[PDB]
Amino acid sequence: EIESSDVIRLIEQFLKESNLHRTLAILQEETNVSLNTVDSIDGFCNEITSGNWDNVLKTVQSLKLPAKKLIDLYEHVIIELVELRELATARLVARQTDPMILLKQIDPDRFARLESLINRPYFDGQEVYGDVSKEKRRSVIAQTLSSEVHVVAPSRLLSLLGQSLKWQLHQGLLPP
Amino acid sequence: EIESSDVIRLIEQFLKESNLHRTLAILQEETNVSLNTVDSIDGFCNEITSGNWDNVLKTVQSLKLPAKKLIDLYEHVIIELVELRELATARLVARQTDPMILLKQIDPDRFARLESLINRPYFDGQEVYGDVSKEKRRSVIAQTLSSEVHVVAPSRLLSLLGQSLKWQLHQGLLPP
Amino acid sequence: QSHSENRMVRSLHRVLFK
Amino acid sequence: QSHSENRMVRSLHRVLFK
Numbered sequence: 001e002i003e004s005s006d007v008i009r010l011i012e013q014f015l016k017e018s019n020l021h022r023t024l025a026i027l028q029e030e031t032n033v034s035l036n037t038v039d040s041i042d043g044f045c046n047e048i049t050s051g052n053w054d055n056v057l058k059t060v061q062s063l064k065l066p067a068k069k070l071i072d073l074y075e076h077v078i079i080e081l082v083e084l085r086e087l088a089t090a091r092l093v094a095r096q097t098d099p100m101i102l103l104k105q106i107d108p109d110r111f112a113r114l115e116s117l118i119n120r121p122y123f124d125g126q127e128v129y130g131d132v133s134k135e136k137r138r139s140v141i142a143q144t145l146s147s148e149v150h151v152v153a154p155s156r157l158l159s160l161l162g163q164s165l166k167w168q169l170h171q172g173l174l175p176p
Numbered sequence: 177e178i179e180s181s182d183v184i185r186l187i188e189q190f191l192k193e194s195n196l197h198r199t200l201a202i203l204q205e206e207t208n209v210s211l212n213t214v215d216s217i218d219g220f221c222n223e224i225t226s227g228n229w230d231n232v233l234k235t236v237q238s239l240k241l242p243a244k245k246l247i248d249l250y251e252h253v254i255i256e257l258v259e260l261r262e263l264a265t266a267r268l269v270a271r272q273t274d275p276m277i278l279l280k281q282i283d284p285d286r287f288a289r290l291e292s293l294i295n296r297p298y299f300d301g302q303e304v305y306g307d308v309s310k311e312k313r314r315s316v317i318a319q320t321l322s323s324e325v326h327v328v329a330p331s332r333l334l335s336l337l338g339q340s341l342k343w344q345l346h347q348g349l350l351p352p
Numbered sequence: 353q354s355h356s357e358n359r360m361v362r363s364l365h366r367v368l369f370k
Numbered sequence: 371q372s373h374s375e376n377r378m379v380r381s382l383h384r385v386l387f388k
Contacts, residue, residue, distance in 0.1 A: 054381035
């Protein structure tokens with residue numbers, strides 16, 4: 001047998017391919033499970049670990065988003081930006097992005113710590129990456145976020161139905 | 177290969193079984209094809225031809241309804257009622273049902289003819305059934321209305337997917 | 353509130369008025 | 371309206387601000 005969530009994911013994929021956006025969104029809302037399509041989960045983890053956050057942010061924009069994983073990921077990307085001394089970009093991301101606004105609202109202290117870190121004239125990596133390494137943070141973020149995402153072949157439902165027709169045609173159905 | 181409408185019907189059936197009413201309705205609206213479940217199309221035609229309009233009206237209430245087939249069917253049932261001299265019931269149906277209201281609005285003359293027929297002290301079947309027999313009217317109505325309806329086995333989609341899994345398991349997929 | 357003559361009449365009345 | 375330093379920076383800026 002197969003889990004309902006998987007079948008609903010197949011349906012949602014079909015809806016996406018058939019350009020039925022409204023029914024797709026309404027479905028995802030009602031059943032509270034969302035399709036999160038990626039070419040490869042390993043490739044996704046690779047993208048997160050390597051440090052290519054433009055792509056990762058693209059994928060993030062594509063999928064259904066939890067606020068917590070968002071504020072975590074965006075926080076880490078903020079620290080990565082302030083490390084590379086892209087102060088303007090980091091401040092703009094911290095100010096003008098939705099998960100960062102949510103973080104600012106819910107926890108003023110955390111946002112204050114991030115802004116304080118950005119305001120510093122130099123990047124003090126010893127303590128922040130001393131407590132937990134960059135590689136480890138990237139690793140846990142990649143793991144938790146990737147476990148949320150799924151991988152499914154294009155027109156999976158149709159192919160499956162084709163297999164069903166092949167079954168009926170060449171093997172046959174049960175007599176009663 | 178298989179028509180898209182059929183697959184969308186399967187999806188809609190799955191939605192109906194899984195109690196996802198909102199997504200069902202939204203789907204039916206967006207794709208503009210509706211599931212019309214009946215135990216048997218032949219049984220449906222039999223129900224229409226035999227003269228069991230309570231059941232037929234039940235089924236009519238269940239399915240998605242076109243205004244034209246509705247005003248036709250309801251008109252014929254009105255004539256059937258006034259034949260059996262159920263004047264109160266026929267008048268109430270003609271007055272308080274949506275397709276009859278629509279018919280009254282769009283064509284006052286037709287509604288006036290029906291009301292005139294109901295007002296007559298006796299039922300003059302010679303002319304009305306002389307032009308076209310009762311059996312013939314029941315026949316054409318049953319044909320047009322039934323051709324609109326569809327028949328699909330319960331949990332069809334799930335069974336099909338099961339067949340797909342059987343295909344993969346016992347026959348196997350193509351190597352490339 | 354339901355005039356019952358024929359079985360099909362009372363049933364169709366039941367369906368249409370509820 | 372897009373400050374371009376690193377390629378990943380200008381691209382992430384492109385994505386976040388559009």
